Design a protein around this ligand. Sequence first.
Ligand SMILES: *[C@@H]1O[C@H](CO)[C@@H](O[C@@H]2O[C@H](CO)[C@@H](O[C@@H]3O[C@H](CO)[C@@H](O)[C@H](O)[C@@H]3O)[C@H](O)[C@H]2NC(C)=O)[C@H](O)[C@H]1NC(C)=O
Ligand SMILES: *[C@@H]1O[C@H](CO)[C@@H](O[C@@H]2O[C@H](CO)[C@@H](O[C@@H]3O[C@H](CO)[C@@H](O)[C@H](O)[C@@H]3O)[C@H](O)[C@H]2NC(C)=O)[C@H](O)[C@H]1NC(C)=O
Ligand SMILES: *[C@@H]1O[C@H](CO)[C@@H](O[C@@H]2O[C@H](CO)[C@@H](O[C@@H]3O[C@H](CO)[C@@H](O)[C@H](O)[C@@H]3O)[C@H](O)[C@H]2NC(C)=O)[C@H](O)[C@H]1NC(C)=O
Ligand SMILES: *[C@@H]1O[C@H](CO)[C@@H](O[C@@H]2O[C@H](CO)[C@@H](O[C@@H]3O[C@H](CO)[C@@H](O)[C@H](O)[C@@H]3O)[C@H](O)[C@H]2NC(C)=O)[C@H](O)[C@H]1NC(C)=O
Ligand SMILES: *[C@@H]1O[C@H](CO)[C@@H](O[C@@H]2O[C@H](CO)[C@@H](O[C@@H]3O[C@H](CO)[C@@H](O)[C@H](O)[C@@H]3O)[C@H](O)[C@H]2NC(C)=O)[C@H](O)[C@H]1NC(C)=O
Lengths: 346, 346, 346, 346, 346
Amino acid sequence: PMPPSEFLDKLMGKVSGYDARIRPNFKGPPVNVTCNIFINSFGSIAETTMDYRVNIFLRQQWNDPRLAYSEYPDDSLDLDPSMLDSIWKPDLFFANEKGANFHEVTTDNKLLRISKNGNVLYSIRITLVLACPMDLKNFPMDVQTCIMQLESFGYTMNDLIFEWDEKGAVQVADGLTLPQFILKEEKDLRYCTKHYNTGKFTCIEARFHLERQMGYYLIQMYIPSLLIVILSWVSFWINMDAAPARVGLGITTVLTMTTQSSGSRASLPKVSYVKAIDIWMAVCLLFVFSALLEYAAVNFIARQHVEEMRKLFISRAKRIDTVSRVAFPLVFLIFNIFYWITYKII
Amino acid sequence: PMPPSEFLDKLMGKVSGYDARIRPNFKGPPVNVTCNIFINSFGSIAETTMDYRVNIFLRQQWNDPRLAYSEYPDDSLDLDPSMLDSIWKPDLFFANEKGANFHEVTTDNKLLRISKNGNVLYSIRITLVLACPMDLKNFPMDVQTCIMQLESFGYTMNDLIFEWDEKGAVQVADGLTLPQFILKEEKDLRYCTKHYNTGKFTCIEARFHLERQMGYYLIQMYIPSLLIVILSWVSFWINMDAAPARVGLGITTVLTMTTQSSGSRASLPKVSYVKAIDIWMAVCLLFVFSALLEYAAVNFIARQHVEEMRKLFISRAKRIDTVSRVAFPLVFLIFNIFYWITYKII
Amino acid sequence: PMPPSEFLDKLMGKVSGYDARIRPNFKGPPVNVTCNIFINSFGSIAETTMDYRVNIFLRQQWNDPRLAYSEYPDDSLDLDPSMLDSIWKPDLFFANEKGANFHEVTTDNKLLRISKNGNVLYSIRITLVLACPMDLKNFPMDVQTCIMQLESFGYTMNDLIFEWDEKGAVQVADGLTLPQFILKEEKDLRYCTKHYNTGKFTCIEARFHLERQMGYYLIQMYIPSLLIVILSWVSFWINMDAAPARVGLGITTVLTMTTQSSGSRASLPKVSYVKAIDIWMAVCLLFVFSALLEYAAVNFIARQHVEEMRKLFISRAKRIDTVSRVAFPLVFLIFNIFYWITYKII
Amino acid sequence: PMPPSEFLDKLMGKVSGYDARIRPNFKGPPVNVTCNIFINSFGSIAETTMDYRVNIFLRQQWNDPRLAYSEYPDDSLDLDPSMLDSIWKPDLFFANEKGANFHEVTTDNKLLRISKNGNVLYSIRITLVLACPMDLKNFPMDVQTCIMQLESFGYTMNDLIFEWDEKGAVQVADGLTLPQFILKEEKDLRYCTKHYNTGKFTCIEARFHLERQMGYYLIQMYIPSLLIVILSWVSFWINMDAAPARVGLGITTVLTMTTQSSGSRASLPKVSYVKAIDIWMAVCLLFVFSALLEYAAVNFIARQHVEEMRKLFISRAKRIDTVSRVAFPLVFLIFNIFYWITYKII
Amino acid sequence: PMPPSEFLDKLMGKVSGYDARIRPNFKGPPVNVTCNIFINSFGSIAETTMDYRVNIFLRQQWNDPRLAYSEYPDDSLDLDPSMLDSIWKPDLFFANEKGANFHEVTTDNKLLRISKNGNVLYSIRITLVLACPMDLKNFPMDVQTCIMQLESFGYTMNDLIFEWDEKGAVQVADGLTLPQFILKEEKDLRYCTKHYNTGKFTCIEARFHLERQMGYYLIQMYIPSLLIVILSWVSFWINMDAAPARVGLGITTVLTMTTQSSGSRASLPKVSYVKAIDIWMAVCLLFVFSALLEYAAVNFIARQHVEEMRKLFISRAKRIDTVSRVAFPLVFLIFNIFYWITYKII
Ligand SMILES: *[C@@H]1O[C@H](CO)[C@@H](O[C@@H]2O[C@H](CO)[C@@H](O[C@@H]3O[C@H](CO)[C@@H](O)[C@H](O)[C@@H]3O)[C@H](O)[C@H]2NC(C)=O)[C@H](O)[C@H]1NC(C)=O
Ligand SMILES: *[C@@H]1O[C@H](CO)[C@@H](O[C@@H]2O[C@H](CO)[C@@H](O[C@@H]3O[C@H](CO)[C@@H](O)[C@H](O)[C@@H]3O)[C@H](O)[C@H]2NC(C)=O)[C@H](O)[C@H]1NC(C)=O
Ligand SMILES: *[C@@H]1O[C@H](CO)[C@@H](O[C@@H]2O[C@H](CO)[C@@H](O[C@@H]3O[C@H](CO)[C@@H](O)[C@H](O)[C@@H]3O)[C@H](O)[C@H]2NC(C)=O)[C@H](O)[C@H]1NC(C)=O
Ligand SMILES: *[C@@H]1O[C@H](CO)[C@@H](O[C@@H]2O[C@H](CO)[C@@H](O[C@@H]3O[C@H](CO)[C@@H](O)[C@H](O)[C@@H]3O)[C@H](O)[C@H]2NC(C)=O)[C@H](O)[C@H]1NC(C)=O
Ligand SMILES: *[C@@H]1O[C@H](CO)[C@@H](O[C@@H]2O[C@H](CO)[C@@H](O[C@@H]3O[C@H](CO)[C@@H](O)[C@H](O)[C@@H]3O)[C@H](O)[C@H]2NC(C)=O)[C@H](O)[C@H]1NC(C)=O
């Protein structure tokens, strides 16, 4: 019989009336293109740019009655991408591309196969740099929702409808791990149908819920902001009434508390609102600034001066050091309980 | 009847006399191309480079009498971008491109449709990195005006005229939020007609007013420059005449005031003029440098030495500490009122 | 006789029935493509992105019975890359490309030669930026395993099978040195056959074992974290009961221990788990934080006050300075033995 | 009559003997191409790379007698860039390109028009990243001279000559402002004719004089290097013979003078010679290092010890503090006059 | 007579038997291609990536007897790069490309001219980013040897041989200066013939010797590491037996010695071996760490306590300050002689 590439030329080229510029079922019902993606790679989720890079296999299935052969004995004719400009393909695009490219190493990484009844599978490999608005109200404990939406660009709703297939519309690779996030298994699949002044265009989208790994910030952000507060509590014991060294422990633990406060937001977007790591680095700034402010209460009370008025100020310069030495591990411990319960509920 | 893509070939190709190199209404009135854009994405507004990235849908409408079919029953013939080099298109360009590319993922993201009377809609998707000169005289409280202008490159004013359409010439996407700025709703639409030695070329432009979010700099730039000034006011209470610790609080709050002064302009352009954050970080440098300069007045007066001359210098080393402890929260509070009223008016 | 380029046109083009879109041995056994690579350049192994760049010569050998000439006198007909779109080529791709390009300087860097029996050698030059997941549990002493896998994209397992040749399937250049790593000579070669819902696709992969050079981190990370611990041991000798200078050596060696702790992870991914350099910079932070905490035990015990109770606290303020001066070089030396034996075993 | 695009095809294509591979006036006098540029954008003048980005309109005018129509009624026939590979064009290149691209958004941004006598205007839009060697001997007060030169690549001097036109050979845009530099109005226009072993090739070049804005470095580099010198002069007043606090003001104002000295050259090329900002940060390092070296002369003389020898060293420990308190504002003020006069003359 | 472009079409195209896929002197001696380069630009020699960027004119001369016209009156026929795919060209490539591109601004920057006897000159413009392994054993005083090598890709040694011409095989531009290095005039030209399992391929290479400019590191690395050692020698004079200020000068000059030690390798590759700047920043770390360790010997000996035993320890607390004040400018001056003589010999 015929070879497939010679048989598929006479099914399409110039003699069968197949025109690649005209959609299937023309002047009839719209073409129902069904889609599913396979995420090979994921990540490099930046926050200065608020974008993330993904590497997908975009599979598109539709029906084309002009490609429905009947007499050839096989069940699926492939088509290499040299002759891929000879069929109709849906004009899918991503509504938040922000730059994207194909992969064309050793061959155009494109797949096409045509069944007997006309079902056309079309799988391409794309690298996307998708845009998602980061919501950083509770920054080390947030759950980001970064989406990707697949629209049509030229055909309206009465000509081309996108659908997610019911048999697992988003597959993820086997050992896909992210360095900072984890990809949750439940992925929302909903519609995003756009209305312009040109017309109404089809749109489908998949949500990805990206929960952070808190274990990094619990090593660099929280514990070196915890030990500086303990280091400011050393000043309550040194020389117990007055020294030129309690000031040096009161000055210096505000410096590296302030430097770490600016260092906690070194590679973050300049958001207007206050976030979760800001109400930690400003309350633990308050517990290390009140320690030097506590000595200024001591060295002003104890530097006041008959026979009765001698010990009456030392009795006010030891009660200020046996209460402010125990009440600060009560106020800081009741803040540390109210903080983490709030961000466990939210 | 005929399919549209076969009908549209005989409307243009080689038999109807349609030449795609010749503008409509030739040797007559100029072509009135009307334009409107749709900002999908906005942002990454850099200031080291003084540019911003935008992602638009550029729609262009004109009239072409050679494309006015009459006998075909429909109202709008589309045209896929494989045959888009066969019509006339206006040679629009952006006068401040600084690099711009199309989007060509899964299909050339281009749209064309031709009405019965000859009206041609032409929507393409462009990513621009536009240039706008930043005016940073009042830096955290400024209202930037970044423009984009759409010129003709080859046709003069007597051959091709650009207009903004009256029905919403600039649309913005629904949930378009910027991390640092806000986009005001009033967008100016004015002309920018260029005159060269080649001729006079048409130009239209849209201004975008970008107001900053002050809430970021009010957390990192102002409050850690506010607490260092309060930290320098602790030195008026410590030991009340003389210490080796008031110097240590006088030195160190100039260090991290100077380090934060260089740290306030880490990612900014090297502008010649003085800005709003510079007359905050240099006046709050003055209140923390005059505190150590105040102790140098104390430790020089109080280190002077009959029976009457003993208490006469302590009476000059306490009046210098009961006035300079209250006058500095008067001068700093009258500066802080004159500062913010100035930048609320401007 | 004929020149080779004219003889090779009639072997393939339009008269011999050779169709370049159809694989060899069609409707028969699968094509057995055998592969080997030649790593020219290697390196720029980043960890923020977790990727590495390689520069290979990808050689592919297969059999094509339609190219088996018999009457031409030579043994190997070459073919320049201008006519390289005329044979069948396997659609190999790398399953973790993350961007890759050819090299096209002065000529397409591509090779093709055809033997008499039909063996086809096909060598191209590719630059890859391959992805490998970094496992940083024991960070300066880890052995990374970064792989590269070579799948088919269009042909399933019953049409195209990849193999590594038995005669040295991965060659490395003569003087290939890495700045941070060393490439071990044993390279694993195993199968990675993928199963999708499209079909099952062939895959071969080569593991590369990249052992680090520990000598860099033993100069910047370990020795300047070793001398700060010795510098905190200077405070046990200074003035031997009480000073305002032991606090100044107790504060300051916690500052540059914490600053170096944040400086130890300046260009690393934000992993959740704790690594080998973190249980050094948090234990040597403990020995420099316990030194200031030791003086707080001294200056609180020695500041307590009949005739018998005078020397009883100095006898408790010297035993605390002749034991804590020797026990800290016992606890730090027994940690330093348990640390390096653990990472020598693992 | 004829449309212009059909008339211009028979003037060139295959019937008039016009060959686009052959220069005008062949085997005769050389082609006199005259050039002028229009700088749209300028800037991003880097110094680590020593290059600057420009965005020009390159206009080229020459004469081509084969394109001299006589009977067509118009005076100027345009030509869209689709048929622009059909005329002869000069093979101009930039001898210091370092990468350059065209602009191809919505149309190839290219212009061509042909007069009646044969004069051909050819305007294109290029983005260049031109290389200029920076001379940083006097760094914040220098006048850079960054050039751009336009050579021929294939035709020698006896076949093609470039000239600048006399009517404004370099135009600059209306509101072109640079953030760091200013572009002087006088632009030198001179020749740069190259001699290779291939031949001698034409070359023209324009010099651009880029004077800096000193006002930025006078806020960050000079004033925080001025106040540290005044801060070191506070140590002459504190306790007036001896303290543990004059050392703390002698140590610390060397630290942030050395840190600012390394911070003054954070983003500069690693030049070998000494520059103007180096002999400010090394002389003001000397005035803050000699202040601590002055106290080491005080605390060594005043710590020497009959009844006559008591006040003879205090008379040497007050003369050292009433001269070194006035002579240092004399030496620093006579340096500050000799410094700025030197860089005002040069 | 004929124009040259029409004469050169009948010399090659389809009638003269010229096939552009077949090398000259086929089934005979190999083609002797002779090469020389012209370095326009050089530099951006990075060391994190260990690569350098060069911008060359690659000239190639071979002989092609099929292009040997005899009857045309000229001596050299040029050929514009539109018809440059019609001759045979050698498939040269660079064996350490790491990315390279042509220059195609206003015309393909390519040159071709054919002499009467068949000699073909072929000059193109290439930008290369070449790889060279940096050897940093003696880092500020090293002489790098970065090479570039020119291989054949498709033709073996018995078909194509590269040579350097004897008339100046590497030219350098007139005013080519590097910011950090200097390019030595003696350039080695040697062979690098490769042996693969495909065959043996020709290769020629040019060594470039890049001697550094030590004058930058002698301002930032060595002098601020010299004054800190002098600053640690101030502590021998302050208060001469005991103070809380000698410790503060002993602590702080270890801090900024350690910070500058990490700051000396901010933008360097993470090499395993020790380099020349590391045995300066670790010996000058030793002279500033032994100064604080010297006071710990003083304040432990002088704090020991009949009538005879009073002055016997002051006699041991002044001999330790009149020897350790002169021996440290003897050990540091004998190190500073042994250091620079070692790196002057090597
Ligand atoms: C692509 O999918 C759409 C959506 O499922 C299909 O449109 C649907 O087609 C069916 C049968 O043609 C329509 O059912 C009909 O409903 C009318 C009342 O409107 C009634 O006379 C019958 O019950 C009849 O079954 C259905 O309304 C229609 N839905 C929409 C939203 O248009 C379309 O046929 C699919 N096209 C292809 C090529 O598969
Ligand atoms: C594109 O838009 C321009 C601007 O509206 C149109 O030009 C205008 O055309 C009208 C009618 O052709 C001109 O009005 C005429 O004015 C003359 C006096 O100059 C008088 O005899 C009549 O009152 C007549 O209506 C109008 O002057 C002219 N304006 C300009 C600035 O040229 C043009 O016709 C439009 N072209 C197309 C193809 O739509
Ligand atoms: C490509 O490689 C595969 C794998 O080596 C080859 O397939 C193998 O082909 C041989 C002979 O055609 C098969 O042996 C046969 O086994 C059957 C029992 O199944 C028995 O009747 C005989 O012993 C006979 O030798 C072998 O089973 C088969 N293996 C597989 C996994 O398919 C294939 O022939 C190679 N193709 C080319 C073009 O070199
Ligand atoms: C392009 O520009 C060059 C330079 O202006 C033109 O070359 C010049 O052409 C004129 C007239 O052809 C030459 O003048 C002649 O000088 C000879 C003595 O050499 C004498 O017999 C006459 O006085 C005559 O006028 C002039 O020497 C020559 N200059 C050079 C440097 O070649 C050229 O003609 C221009 N070409 C075109 C196509 O415009
Ligand atoms: C390209 O360059 C190579 C190397 O210079 C040339 O090969 C050399 O060709 C000469 C003459 O054809 C050979 O000399 C011959 O030597 C044999 C002994 O082997 C003897 O019968 C004669 O003395 C005769 O002169 C020489 O051996 C040969 N060298 C090599 C290494 O092959 C080649 O001819 C050049 N090709 C062109 C087209 O210029």
